[PDB]
Amino acid sequence: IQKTPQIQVYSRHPPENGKPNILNCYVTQFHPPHIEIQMLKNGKKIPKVEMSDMSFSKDWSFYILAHTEFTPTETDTYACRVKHASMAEPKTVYWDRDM
Amino acid sequence: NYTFRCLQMSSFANRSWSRTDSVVWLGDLQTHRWSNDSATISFTKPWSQGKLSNQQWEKLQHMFQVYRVSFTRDIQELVKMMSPKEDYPIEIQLSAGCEMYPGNASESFLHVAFQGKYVVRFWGTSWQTVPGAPSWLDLPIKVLNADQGTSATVQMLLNDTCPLFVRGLLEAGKSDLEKQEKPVAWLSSHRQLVCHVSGFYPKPVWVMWMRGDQEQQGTHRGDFLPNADETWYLQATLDVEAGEEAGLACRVKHSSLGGQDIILYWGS
Numbered sequence A: 001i002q003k004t005p006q007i008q009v010y011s012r013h014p015p016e017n018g019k020p021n022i023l024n025c026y027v028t029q030f031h032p033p034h035i036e037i038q039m040l041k042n043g044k045k046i047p048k049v050e051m052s053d054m055s056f057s058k059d060w061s062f063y064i065l066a067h068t069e070f071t072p073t074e075t076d077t078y079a080c081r082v083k084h085a086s087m088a089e090p091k092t093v094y095w096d097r098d099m
Numbered sequence B: 001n002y003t004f005r006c007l008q009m010s011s012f013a014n015r016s017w018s019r020t021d022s023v024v025w026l027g028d029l030q031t032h033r034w035s036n037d038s039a040t041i042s043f044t045k046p047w048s049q050g051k052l053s054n055q056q057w058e059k060l061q062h063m064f065q066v067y068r069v070s071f072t073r074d075i076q077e078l079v080k081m082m083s084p085k086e087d088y089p090i091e092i093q094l095s096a097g098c099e100m101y102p103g104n105a106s107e108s109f110l111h112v113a114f115q116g117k118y119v120v121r122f123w124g125t126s127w128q129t130v131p132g133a134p135s136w137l138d139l140p141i142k143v144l145n146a147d148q149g150t151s152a153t154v155q156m157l158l159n160d161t162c163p164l165f166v167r168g169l170l171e172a173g174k175s176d177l178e179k180q181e182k183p184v185a186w187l188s189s190h191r192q193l194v195c196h197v198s199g200f201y202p203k204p205v206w207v208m209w210m211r212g213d214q215e216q217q218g219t220h221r222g223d224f225l226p227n228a229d230e231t232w233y234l235q236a237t238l239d240v241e242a243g244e245e246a247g248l249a250c251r252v253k254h255s256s257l258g259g260q261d262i263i264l265y266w267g268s
């Protein structure tokens, strides 16, 4: 049966405005493994995103980590958008500015 | 304890399209990947060959190379034989490896899932279906059990090659496996206070909201989330009534810190 992806978005270092950092999007609990993940800055696709190899957990569901350099500031939003057969529309999760 | 697990994920889209990819972990550190696009198994650490010689690595690689092709032909034949009773798309996953415990003891495993559900393991000297697996798997598993050379190879790999190879990995990779990286922490937010702790390794950590020496009971620990640099991230949250946040602190204990805990005071 298909399982729907969960998406968590969080920063490698304390987010401090104007300071270069790393934003992570961790996508888990999904099946089947085919998926497309984009990271968004102000609603636009961020070009250089790096992905880990796909792997799977003890319960057999897949997971993968995407990450990108970013500089938070109080005029930019960040998000992670996922397309998967389990959902009719892409699911987008915004960084909550704290994580 | 350290668990070594070789994880294979194979996708069969239809008669003409399939792919097989694997990753290998020792504990929470990745040691290999093997892309479908690649003829050979790639190292992800300076010590991914453990204590094997260039020549013994090539022979182990050779065996997997034959298996990857054998595996793909076997599943594609099975689907033809069963057709159209078992339609594509098909997803097969295998998790195999060994757990190294206290002393020099170890236990090995080889589990197989089909469409996301555990169906088959190798145990002792044979392949078995697990109870609840679809009954059409019985006959192909009986046939695979007649293949004595495959059974002998699998018993060797599970009972002998695995713990041997992982002993070489644990020696060769010692400095990475015993690395200590220090967490940084920061606070944010009746309301819900959040303590974020990131960049620690190894995984065990203690994170708690404190008033003074008193641990605050309502502390909820989040899930452990990986960073992209082989370190860990965790949040602990505490719902507090508005006003009563003065006097609260997040406390972090971790092997890398010595006994110099991080203490971060709210409103500080």
Ligand SMILES: *[C@@H]1O[C@H](CO[C@@H]2O[C@@H](C)[C@@H](O)[C@@H](O)[C@@H]2O)[C@@H](O[C@@H]2O[C@H](CO)[C@@H](O[C@@H]3O[C@H](CO[C@H]4O[C@H](CO)[C@@H](O)[C@H](O)[C@@H]4O)[C@@H](O)[C@H](O[C@H]4O[C@H](CO)[C@@H](O)[C@H](O)[C@@H]4O)[C@@H]3O)[C@H](O)[C@H]2NC(C)=O)[C@H](O)[C@H]1NC(C)=O
Pocket (backbone or CB within 6 Å): B106, B107, B108, B109, B110, B122, B123, B124, B125, B155, B156, B158, B159
């Ligand atoms: C590799 O190790 C295997 C054991 O390890 C487990 O499985 C492997 C794959 C790993 O995952 C590991 O970490 C696991 O813990 C080992 O398998 C053992 O092999 C022997 C024979 O080679 C089996 O012996 C036969 O046992 C049956 C009884 O089996 C049933 O009962 C026992 C308990 O009593 C259960 O454990 C079994 O699950 C079954 O419920 C006997 O009937 C049979 O005796 C007959 O045949 C022999 C000739 O071989 C005669 O001499 C006898 O007198 C009888 O005629 C055997 O005694 C043993 O069951 C099996 N263990 C398991 C769990 O299946 C394997 O051999 C190792 N291979 C190599 C190369 O090292």
Ligand SMILES: *[C@@H]1O[C@H](CO)[C@@H](O[C@@H]2O[C@H](CO)[C@@H](O[C@@H]3O[C@H](CO)[C@@H](O)[C@H](O[C@H]4O[C@H](CO)[C@@H](O)[C@H](O)[C@@H]4O[C@H]4O[C@H](CO)[C@@H](O)[C@H](O)[C@@H]4O)[C@@H]3O)[C@H](O)[C@H]2NC(C)=O)[C@H](O)[C@H]1NC(C)=O
Pocket (backbone or CB within 6 Å): B017, B018, B019, B020, B036, B037, B069
């Ligand atoms: C995962 O890895 C496995 C193992 O390698 C891949 O399996 C191999 O896949 C290749 C390519 O699909 C396949 O090679 C083909 O064999 C066909 C017949 O079975 C050939 O007919 C075909 O030749 C054409 O394509 C070549 C380019 O790849 C051209 O060089 C050649 O000139 C031919 O081109 C003509 O025909 C093609 C259509 O095939 C057409 O598009 C062109 O215009 C032109 O007219 C291939 O050589 C291997 O046999 C497979 N090896 C195996 C199974 O061991 C597997 O595909 C990977 N999976 C994924 C998703 O990447």
Ligand SMILES: CCCCCCCCCCCCCC[C@@H](O)[C@@H](O)[C@H](CO[C@H]1O[C@H](CO)[C@H](O)[C@H](O)[C@H]1O)NC(=O)CCCCCCCc1ccccc1
Pocket (backbone or CB within 6 Å): B006, B007, B008, B022, B063, B066, B067, B068, B070, B071, B074, B075, B078, B090, B092, B094, B095, B096, B110, B112, B114, B119, B120, B144, B147, B148, B149, B150, B153, B154
């Ligand atoms: C549709 C749902 C199906 C559910 C899946 C069923 C589980 C299938 C598991 C089948 C695994 C083996 C597949 C290949 C075998 O069938 C053999 O073709 C193949 C070749 O066999 C010939 O050569 C050998 C020489 O080495 C022997 O002489 C043998 O006698 C001879 O028949 N045997 C081999 O290649 C033996 C080595 C098998 C190793 C299995 C490793 C599994 C694994 C990989 C990665 C991660 C985790 C786990």
Ligand SMILES: CCCCCCCCCCCCCCCC(=O)O
Pocket (backbone or CB within 6 Å): B006, B007, B008, B022, B023, B024, B032, B034, B041, B060, B064, B096, B097, B110, B154, B157, B158, B161, B162, B165
């Ligand atoms: C029984 C199948 C897997 C168990 C192999 C025991 C460990 C031997 C060491 C191999 C290191 C890398 C092998 C990965 C190959 C693959 O993923 O297909």
Ligand SMILES: *[C@@H]1O[C@H](CO)[C@@H](O)[C@H](O)[C@H]1NC(C)=O
Pocket (backbone or CB within 6 Å): B013, B014, B015, B016, B017
């Ligand atoms: C099989 O599926 C592949 C991958 O999804 C798709 O591109 C194509 O329709 C199929 N390939 C062939 C040769 O029919």
